[model samples]
Target chain A: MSPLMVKVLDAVRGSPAINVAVHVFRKAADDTWEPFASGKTSESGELHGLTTEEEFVEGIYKVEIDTKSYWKALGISPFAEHAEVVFTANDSGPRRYTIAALLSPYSYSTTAVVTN
Target chain B: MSPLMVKVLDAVRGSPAINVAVHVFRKAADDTWEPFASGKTSESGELHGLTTEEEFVEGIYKVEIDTKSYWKALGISPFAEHAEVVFTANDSGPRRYTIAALLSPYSYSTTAVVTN
Candidate 1:
């Protein structure tokens, strides 16, 4: 089992959105969101070690990106304040997954997949 | 009151995701999704005239992008099958909003804002 990796990028510019916040959540038995990991993207808009597959259990998970604050840093009017990606992480194989977000001032897109 | 505008782009290439499907939904009193509008992106990855503000009432709205089929058309592995953006559309004035999506193979970002 490998670690979960996350990355953020500017959609229009094709560049990294540096210093953006990223959060991970796992759905609890009661269907409530429980915090799993949190961090910020580096200068290259990347964050790793969210959690290894050994530590992650089979269930629904979500990754949220703070798009409002990221755009605010550049003085752009906030559109969607938060962009969220919700998916089911099952017990597949040893492949690792990556949650990535592509962002612009007025829009964002995110996906999670088995990268390796 | 103006119409809602939507756009789709490739986050990595900084280009349009042409001919992608876009759907809009408004939450009903029973908390079920009611289809509001549906269309496909143009050559520039844009879709306008979703609904006029006069026709659109104040409520929670959601926009969905068909990411799997779009990526499949490009012969890439699908990460997130669907990317959704949920937001509140209040009667804040005559201001209109734009819902946009930036997408990559493994990630996507979306935001909705009062573009004008």
Candidate 2:
């Protein structure tokens, strides 16, 4: 498993939100967002390797997922422009984060299983 | 009415999770998590005003939500350690955020209706 990853599930449809884009960003020293990585969810509604242990240092990270686009493709207008998740990583040492977001056109929520 | 708030619904019991602790932390200068506010979920499974506008400046924030304890109280063992969320706020000057978590013993997801 990758050290840092993401998954999205459609709460309404009860299936993976396949093909949604996941853009990773890191907060830089000057307090600006720097593009760190990018990918689209597979059929499993997952994107592997947002970062590896060695690459993902202690810092703030954000993932910008266009949930509206996911809904738009299905002819629904989502309230949110993006499903953005932000978190601080590795305050002590590297820990694996499986960020899971379950969403519907009406609303969505994100959770993570952080483990050693 | 405050700008920042939270809600938690138990997908398993099909009810709001009452008395769950929600601890809010603000990332202070020199990069330390300073305790900002704390509260438990109401009968509505919601916590209003973990922060006010003046207090919630543009910075990194974290909410430590212990979802596992909610399950344990019902005598069910959950898979997660906590529902920890981190995000940057007030970049474009204060959005009303309702961070809601829909959770079950098997899995959980969070979604926010961020109103600008």
Which candidate has the highest TM-score of all? 1
| Candidate 1's DockQ | 0.36
Which candidate should be chosen as best, given lDDT against the real structure?
2
Q: Which ten residues in a row have the lowest lDDT in candidate 1 chain A?
A: A86-95
lDDT of 2 by residue, B1-116 (tens): 77889898999779999999999888889987899889999999999867778877888777778777888898976655466556667767788978887777545566667887
Q: How many residue pairs in model 1 have overlapping backbones?
A: 9
Residue range B1-116, candidate 1, lDDT tens digits: 34678899887778999999989999899988899988899998988767876788787778888877898888875656577787767646555777777787666666566744
Tens-digit lDDT track for model 1 on A2-106? 367788888766789898888889899988889988888898898876677567888777787887788878887655647888766667742677776777766
Clashing pairs in 1: A107-B111, A108-B109, A108-B110, A108-B111, A109-B108, A109-B109, A109-B110, A110-B108, A110-B109
lDDT measured at residue B87 in model 2 versus the true structure, 0 to 100 = 64
Per-residue lDDT of model 2, residues A1-116, tens digit only: 56878888997888999989888889999998899888889999999966666777877777778786788898875655566666667567437887788888756666656778
